[PDB]
Amino acid sequence: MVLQNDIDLLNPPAELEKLKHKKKRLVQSPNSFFMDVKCQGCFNITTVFSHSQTVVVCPGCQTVLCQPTGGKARLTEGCSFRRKGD
Amino acid sequence: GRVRTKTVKKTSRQVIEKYYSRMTLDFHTNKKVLEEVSILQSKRLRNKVAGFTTHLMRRIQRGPVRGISLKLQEEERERRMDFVPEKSALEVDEIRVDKETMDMLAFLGMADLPGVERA
Amino acid sequence: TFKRRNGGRNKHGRGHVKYIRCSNCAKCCPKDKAIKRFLVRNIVEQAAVRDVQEACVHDGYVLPKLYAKVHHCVSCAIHAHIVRVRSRENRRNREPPQ
Amino acid sequence: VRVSVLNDALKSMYNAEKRGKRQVMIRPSSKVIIKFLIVMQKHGYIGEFEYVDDHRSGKIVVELNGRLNKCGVISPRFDVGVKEIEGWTARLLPSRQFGYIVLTTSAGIMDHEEARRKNVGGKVLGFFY
Amino acid sequence: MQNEVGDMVDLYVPRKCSATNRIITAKDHASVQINIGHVDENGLYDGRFTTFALSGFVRAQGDADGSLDRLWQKRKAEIKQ
Amino acid sequence: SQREQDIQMMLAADVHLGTKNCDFQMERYVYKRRTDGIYIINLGKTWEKLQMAARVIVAIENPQDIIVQSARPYGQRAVLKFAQYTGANAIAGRHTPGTFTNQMQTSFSEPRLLILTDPRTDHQPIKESALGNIPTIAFCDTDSPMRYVDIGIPANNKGKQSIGCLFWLLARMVLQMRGTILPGHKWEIMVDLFF
RNA sequence: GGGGCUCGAAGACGAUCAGAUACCGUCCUAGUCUCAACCAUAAACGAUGCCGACCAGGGAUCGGCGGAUGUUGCAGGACUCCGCCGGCACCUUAUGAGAAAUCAAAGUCUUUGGGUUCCGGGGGGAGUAUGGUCGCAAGGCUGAAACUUAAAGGAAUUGAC
Ligand SMILES: [K+]
Ligand SMILES: [Mg+2]
Ligand SMILES: [Mg+2]
Ligand SMILES: [Mg+2]
Ligand SMILES: [Mg+2]
Ligand SMILES: [Mg+2]
Ligand SMILES: [Mg+2]
């Protein structure tokens, strides 16, 4: 790792930017995503933010899904998580 | 005191370096050899040199020292070239490979080397 | 001429630190600057432990320890040989002895 | 605060050049920075450089060829006529044989020799040699 | 450099480092020059070599090894290996 | 020979092991780190790095001014040979300061190339070669400065097998390049390994 | 105004000393604590104004976050490993700077220009005189001149002590 003389700033390695700060990447990108949380029962289509801040509910039993924390929302053990993307 | 001047130390080292063949353990033999193999003016300087040479023969009869050379083990060469076994110490089979080295051999190297092991 | 990088004390990121009093002269010295030692010793020493062993009523009595954290000002510490004056290059050596 | 992005760009480029780097990154980019780099490249003091669109201000990645000794801005942007160029040449440049002063004239951003050719004046952006 | 006649006027033309392009001064005693020999298809040294020069600055930096390795990888492509 | 044989041999000789850490150099040579913190330095790059070193050292046809140095008392045996297999000279153990700068010293000998067992151990010859335009080749490990060494082979210098096997492999390919070793096999069964 | 343990300017006494209104002992007043008001100074120091960019490496640590990990008389908490941001520092080394000590900023400075505030011009007289102004006062802020002087001073070096 002599210095950037060996790497190319234009085409940097695709995994080293998976670890840098989002602002400090070559092009700024969010670190979050949106996920459609599926409860144990029906009504499995609700969409929630990864770094959510509001305690979302469900139409059935209000089925508390996530708790807001300092980072990613604390999903419950009973709620299944899969992610939706662009 | 009884410590030896650099001159007598040096001359003792040289006479042992070039005349280790015949010189013996007794002090009087050492001095009677010194008187003709080298020119020393003071008789008591010669006695000091002979006694010092005797002391270094006592030192060397147990093992080599850091002072003298020539015939460079003590008197005979060929000490370590004879340490050549009929088989090389380096084995080629099941040669000391771990998980990360297995991942390496999955990289540019060949994962089917003869010495690959699951350790 | 600045003899030491830290100024002889151990203050960074703060402005005030309460003092203590030297155990020999009772001189007010900042807590971080004072030479602090922790000495732990038997109440009775080797010449005494032998004579107190048999004098003890029961053999199961372990001899009690004593622990004391003492603080010294620079003058008292130097005069009592707690810390000596070191050479210029050895001054930076913060490694404790042994 | 960032009061002159041109100074930051030139200073980062010069610092990277002194350290023997082959590429340098400039952030944020701007049109005047691009024009200054274009002049420097045309005269043959740098090489390739590419602008990266980050949708906010853009970055520049510049390829160095080791030919640039010094490059730096002049602040504030003093106004120079055609008759004063010589004087500034005697101040910012090593010798009359080479070196360049960049002027932002109303005909665009150019060097001082081109300004004398077109007989136009303006403000002084920086210099490089 | 060049006179109006078109002749040399300086005593000599210096070497410049093959990594950082900065020139090598006559009193630069950390500046070195390496000849890397080439081989044939069997692996026989043929008597010809590629020459590189490194200035004292790049050596003292500690990037001499990386720069020389990169230079060799780049240069061997034209002349095969 | 074929790279596979040399790679498997240095695998046997444990030349791929690193240390608990590395400097900001040699990440071009490491492969990753084990969970214990050791490094697994990629022998593949080491192979053609020492191959290019061999290309370098058979280029001057006057092997007299090539001193191999070894300050550590563990690789002295390897440096003892590689000086009569080739024409290189070799100073083992102690390197008196002034042998590259003091022209009145009895041991004054200015080379055209230096070979060093480890840049950390004998740094004094490195610093002295910096004052004479002496190109330098060393077998750097992780935690070894790149300060003046010009060609650095990423190997181990703390192992009985690593040193010795590595030196023999270098000398073997150097003799191969010189042409003395026409396509054949080893006639120098491991002797340099420590007694 | 209250409180007033301990310690202790002033004061007294003992001791030492050629002398001791000092250092050492003892008893102590204002003070040390608190409430309501004044003062506006410190070696108030990192003797290093604030904002911004770049330029070597390393490990430790504090706060938050992301990932992996396999133990806890118990998802989470404690511990281990990797990474990001922010902070107090530390170690090695100049290819940098500097009169040097030394400094990773005190670097990117005759190849001199990112923005901005304050502030110095040989040593004394002197932070003095006077005027102005704030304060109950002690004092604070602003602040000269005549005259005198060839050195004063900083860092490092060798001796001597
Ligand atoms: K202290
Ligand atoms: Mg002093
Ligand atoms: Mg703070
Ligand atoms: Mg304070
Ligand atoms: Mg003040
Ligand atoms: Mg943490
Ligand atoms: Mg004055």
Short mmCIF file of C-alpha atoms (C1' of nucleotides) in Angstrom, two decimals, chain D residues 1-3 7 11 14-15 18-19 21 70 73-75 91-92 129, chain G residues 51-56 95 104 107-115:
data_model
loop_
_atom_site.label_atom_id
_atom_site.label_comp_id
_atom_site.label_asym_id
_atom_site.label_seq_id
_atom_site.Cartn_x
_atom_site.Cartn_y
_atom_site.Cartn_z
CA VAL D 1 -14.69 28.81 5.35
CA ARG D 2 -14.00 27.88 1.72
CA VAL D 3 -13.52 31.36 0.29
CA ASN D 7 -6.68 28.14 -4.18
CA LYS D 11 -2.64 23.96 -3.42
CA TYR D 14 0.94 21.33 -5.93
CA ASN D 15 1.20 19.39 -2.66
CA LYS D 18 5.78 17.63 -4.63
CA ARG D 19 5.14 14.19 -3.11
CA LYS D 21 1.88 11.37 -6.76
CA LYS D 70 4.97 25.39 -8.87
CA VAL D 73 -3.28 31.57 -7.15
CA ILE D 74 -2.93 35.31 -6.59
CA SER D 75 -5.32 36.90 -4.10
CA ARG D 91 7.50 39.32 -10.10
CA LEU D 92 5.76 35.95 -10.38
CA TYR D 129 5.74 27.10 -14.15
"C1'" C G 51 -12.47 29.59 10.25
"C1'" G G 52 -11.00 26.43 5.73
"C1'" A G 53 -7.96 22.91 2.34
"C1'" C G 54 -3.88 19.71 1.64
"C1'" C G 55 0.40 17.07 3.17
"C1'" A G 56 3.80 10.25 6.64
"C1'" U G 95 11.59 13.92 2.07
"C1'" A G 104 3.14 16.09 12.08
"C1'" G G 107 4.89 22.12 7.36
"C1'" U G 108 2.71 23.35 2.22
"C1'" C G 109 7.62 30.89 2.47
"C1'" U G 110 12.66 35.15 -1.85
"C1'" U G 111 9.38 29.11 -6.13
"C1'" U G 112 7.13 35.09 -0.92
"C1'" G G 113 -0.73 36.38 -1.88
"C1'" G G 114 -7.10 31.27 1.28
"C1'" G G 115 -10.33 34.93 4.83
#
